[PDB]
Amino acid sequence: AGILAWFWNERFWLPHNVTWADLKNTEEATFPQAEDLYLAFPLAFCIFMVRLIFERFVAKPCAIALNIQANGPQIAPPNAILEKVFTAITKHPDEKRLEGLSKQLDWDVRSIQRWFRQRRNQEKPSTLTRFCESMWRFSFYLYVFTYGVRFLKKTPWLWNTRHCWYNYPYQPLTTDLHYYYILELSFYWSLMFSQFTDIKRKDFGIMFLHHLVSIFLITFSYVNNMARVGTLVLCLHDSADALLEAAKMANYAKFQKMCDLLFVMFAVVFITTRLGIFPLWVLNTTLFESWEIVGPYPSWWVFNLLLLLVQGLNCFWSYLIVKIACKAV
Amino acid sequence: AGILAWFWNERFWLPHNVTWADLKNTEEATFPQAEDLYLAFPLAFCIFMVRLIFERFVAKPCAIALNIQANGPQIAPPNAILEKVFTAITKHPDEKRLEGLSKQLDWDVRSIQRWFRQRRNQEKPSTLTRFCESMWRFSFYLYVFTYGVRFLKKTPWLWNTRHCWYNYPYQPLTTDLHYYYILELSFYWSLMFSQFTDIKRKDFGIMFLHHLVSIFLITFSYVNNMARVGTLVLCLHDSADALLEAAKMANYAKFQKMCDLLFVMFAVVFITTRLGIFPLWVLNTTLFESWEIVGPYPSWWVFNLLLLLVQGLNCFWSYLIVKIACKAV
Amino acid sequence: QVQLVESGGGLVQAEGSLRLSCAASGRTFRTYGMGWFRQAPGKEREFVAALNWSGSSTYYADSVKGRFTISRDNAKNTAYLQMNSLKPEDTAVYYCAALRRKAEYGSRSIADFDSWSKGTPVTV
Amino acid sequence: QVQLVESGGGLVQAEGSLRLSCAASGRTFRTYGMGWFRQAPGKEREFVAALNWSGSSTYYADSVKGRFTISRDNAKNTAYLQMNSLKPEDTAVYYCAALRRKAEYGSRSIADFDSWSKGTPVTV
Ligand SMILES: *C(=O)CCCCCCCCCCCCCCC
Ligand SMILES: *C(=O)CCCCCCCCCCCCCCC
Ligand SMILES: *[C@@H]1O[C@H](CO)[C@@H](O)[C@H](O)[C@H]1NC(C)=O
Ligand SMILES: *[C@@H]1O[C@H](CO)[C@@H](O)[C@H](O)[C@H]1NC(C)=O
């Protein structure tokens, strides 16, 4: 109890001469509170149930009618040395590892590469589940982006970002903004549920740090009443995620040309939104306008850093795109 | 919004001439509210994280030091007809199925039974994970039962059940009762998380209906301020669950005599608590005392039925015990 | 959290009958358990009767059980105490109180009742 | 939700200087955006100046910008309006108001301000 009061130091989050008692809900206006973020877990559980139903009953028949392999992976040819290496040394050999395996086994590099690819396919999930998951992600991202556009087109701070801080933190919470924030947090918690326990044969890497940071930001911006500037980020970062899933679906459906077109469009949108618009719009309204309108407050030094971190991550992703798109040309 | 108001009809849940506005929290007393049940999902997620950490870091080294097979199942001998039957017909043949398979394959019943047992072990999880899960369940159940005993030993309604309804529903909510209810709901939600998505190669049968009913009762008793009578049920039904896990651990550790002793003690406690004490204590204070103290209200006709349902389920479990204990003699 | 006003007090002959009334000015009279206490000359206050909010359960003292009947009317926001076969030992000052939302049912102590009242003298 | 009292009004010679004060009796003066309006003989009310709760951002009217300065003191719970190089067109009744917790910053309409005040006459 006391440690929670220590963490929520009113001289750290809120600006100068502003206390949490000023943000208490009353009959005049409604302000965001931390207790409103507890519904996110039940809504995430409901979203996970709906996702399971959609994958098992809706996406699977469509994939079957789309000529998607309903069986599992293939069977690698038997080999004692290769099996021992796969179980002990590694599972995804590189060029040097392939050369070493060819030298040790006195076999061609192509045969060893094919055997290891078959073993990886055995360890990897089937195409049907990935197609269903991609379809669910595409539908959810499309709906989220459409709702974000519809909500933001009428807001006053979309065109003038300085309105995000003019009356901060004394800004009432509307139903649409609360629904948007709760939906985003619920989707991220649903992703956490599907990542942590649905299948433990996964990777906890960049996309998990990214998820954790996104949930961190959405929570500590909602509790700090920084909800007018978080909607811009949420709508900006969900614009390109609706095309990668379509590209994956096209790739799985043996549609190479459609996959290439969707992937190049996704690359263009991703680069433009997260390298051209983000640093000149969101970092502009966060680093400079907030400083000159709200003044210096400690929590600022936190939030900006995290945003910069996100930018760095997306820069890394740009690398992983810029080469692949070169192959797509 | 309107449908939620329709569902929470004040003439259905609360007694006559009692409205929800009478149960609003004020400076004089604190009453349970539905909004307090939203923390259950975050606490269940935390419990699931702690369970994963305990299984991977605490229970596994102890099982290794206890000489528990750290490898997977065995390999069944190859057979085309047997494999086709296993993939198509069934996985757990009965006596008639075993006779039919022996007639078709012209093989001994023992060989086919051994092959199908090996195949089932291949499909079944390894002993290590089951031992870790049993250890976690044993620890959690022991702690819950100890806390329930410590809380109930000082309460006034444990010795006289009529105190559960004398001031109902105008009974203040204490910190200990709230903690107990939230802990129980969190544990049940953690079980739901570990059942629904952790492994889909499970069975959704009696223990899932039982879980759903338990969560139903704990929620709709907490929101109805029937918390003085729910603690008795929660402490009564958790007395025997702390011995079955110990019996399973003893069985897995190649300790047959200890397993038999623990299982017979568990059977005695289970029968006594859920067949001798439950109908004469909880059904007594629910069917009769509640009727003569609180009077007739509609929600009563619901709750009792569910309790009876639970009793029936436990009767079924008694059957599954009464034969097995006969083998244990 | 309620204001209690008593009535019906007075002086009656031996083996008489009295009906003391306790009224509350508020809408929360139906959510508290009322009670009646006596105070004889000397000694201290004694418990007489009590009942919960619904009036289904009533409990009296050992020396007064069988003669006093305590009831309530939530429509009129009032409580009644009827006395039968009065005794000279019943001459005392009678007080009307209420359980303080936290005392358990069956309490027979002064400290368990918060909202007291002026009380009325009864002489046999 | 606050009570506003104005002062500093009066009559001054041409090209004079005035300092109108608007005080509030409450602890919530620091959480509202204050504003000053004028009302000349005839026509209707006109917008003069406004600022948010912190006082960092201030915005005036087109015809008065460069001569009027609006500021606030949250320690004293007051707002000040300083006039430089007055003109005969400035003779009007001045009113002090406040944004009603929902109107966006930059509003220049009468309906966006709830807590009005008596106002003071200024004659050049
Ligand atoms: C991955 O690249 C996409 C991550 C999406 C980020 C979502 C975060 C939204 C909340 C932003 C809050 C920032 C406000 C603080 C500024 C001072
Ligand atoms: C399985 O056999 C054990 C199930 C445990 C049941 C837990 C339910 C506790 C809540 C009881 C509420 C009943 C109150 C209603 C009585 C009128
Ligand atoms: C309920 O209240 C009404 C009016 O307040 C009254 O007429 C009725 O007798 C009461 N019923 C019970 C059971 O208290
Ligand atoms: C904060 O308030 C104090 C006293 O109320 C005052 O002295 C100080 O100038 C104020 N600071 C700001 C930045 O408003």
Edge-first strand order for the sheet with D18-24 is: D4-7, D18-24, D78-83, D68-73
Resolution in angstroms, to 1 decimal, for this deposition? 3.2
Q: What is the CATH number of the domain that holds D78?
A: 2.60.40.10
Q: Are D7 and D23 in contact (CB under 8 A)?
A: yes
Greatest Cα pair distance in chain C = 40
* In a domain? residue D116: no
Nearest alpha-carbon partner for A95 in A115, A108, A113: A113
Burial label for A150, CB within 10 Å (0-12, 13-18, 19+), is exposed
| Local structure of A22: helix, strand or coil | helix
For C19, residues 6+ apart whose C-beta sits below 8 A from its C-beta are C8, C80, C81, C82, C83
Q: Give chain C positions within 8 Å (CB) of B28.
A: 1, 101
The first and second tokens of residue B61, run together, are 């080294």
Residue A52's H or E segment, with its range, is helix A40-54
* In a domain? residue C116: no
Distance CA B273, CA A285 (A): 65
Q: Are C70 and C36 in contact (CB under 8 A)?
A: yes
Nearest alpha-carbon partner for B30 in B272, B225, B194, B195: B225
| Local structure of A58: helix, strand or coil | helix
* In a domain? residue C87: yes
Q: Are D95 and D117 in contact (CB under 8 A)?
A: yes
The first and second tokens of residue B179, run together, are 């903690």
User: Does B286 contact ligand 2 (Cβ within 6 A)?
Assistant: yes
> Which method was used?
cryo-EM
Distance CA C11, CA C20 (A): 12
Within its chain, how far is the Cα of A137 from the centroid? 10
C in contact with B (at least 3 C-beta pairs within 8 A):
yes
What b/e sequence results for B125-152 when a residue is b if at least 16 CB atoms lie within 10 Å of its CB, and e otherwise? eebbebbbbbbbbbbbbbebbebbeebb
Specify the number of domains making up chain C: 1
Q: Are C116 and C36 in contact (CB under 8 A)?
A: no
Residue span of the structural domain in which D57 resides: 4-101
| Local structure of D120: helix, strand or coil | strand
> Least CB-CB distance to A197: which of B39, B41, B197?
B197
* Long-range contact set of residues B272-275: C-beta below 8 Å, sequence gap at least 24: B273/B236, B273/B237, B273/B239, B273/B240, B274/B236, B274/B237, B274/B240, B274/B311, B274/B314, B274/B317, B274/B318, B275/B314, B275/B315, B275/B318
Site residues for ligand 3, CB cut-off 6 Å: B 16-17; C 74-75
Residue type at B141 in one-letter notation: Y
> From ligand 4's centre to the CA of D101, what distance in Å?
21
What CATH fold (topology level) applies to the domain B80-123?
Arc Repressor Mutant, subunit A (1.10.10)
For C90, residues 6+ apart whose C-beta sits below 8 A from its C-beta are C38, C83, C122, C124
Q: Are A172 and A31 in contact (CB under 8 A)?
A: yes
- Residue A289, phi then psi, degrees to nearest 5: -65, -40
* In a domain? residue C107: no
C-alpha distances in Å from residue B151, one per residue of B156, B230, B234, C103? 11, 13, 12, 18
DSSP letters of B91-132?
Answer: SS--HHHHHHHHHHHT--HHHHHHHHHHHHHHHSPPHHHHHH
In chain B, where the domains are located: 80-123, 152-328
Q: Give the residue from A25, A164, A167, A173 with the most D CB atoms within 10 Å of its CB, the best one to mutate.
A: A167
- Cβ separation of B163 and C105 shorter than 8 Å? yes
Residue B176's H or E segment, with its range, is helix B175-196
Cβ contacts below 8 Å, chain A against chain D, sum to 36
Distance CA D113, CA D124 (A): 27
Burial label for B13, CB within 10 Å (0-12, 13-18, 19+), is buried
**φ/ψ bin of B315: left (φ > 0), alpha (ψ from -120 to 50), beta (otherwise):** alpha
The first and second tokens of residue D69, run together, are 């300065």
Distance CA A150, CA B135 (A): 52
Residue type at A5 in one-letter notation: A
Residues in chain A: 329
C121 CB within 8 Å of a chain B CB: no
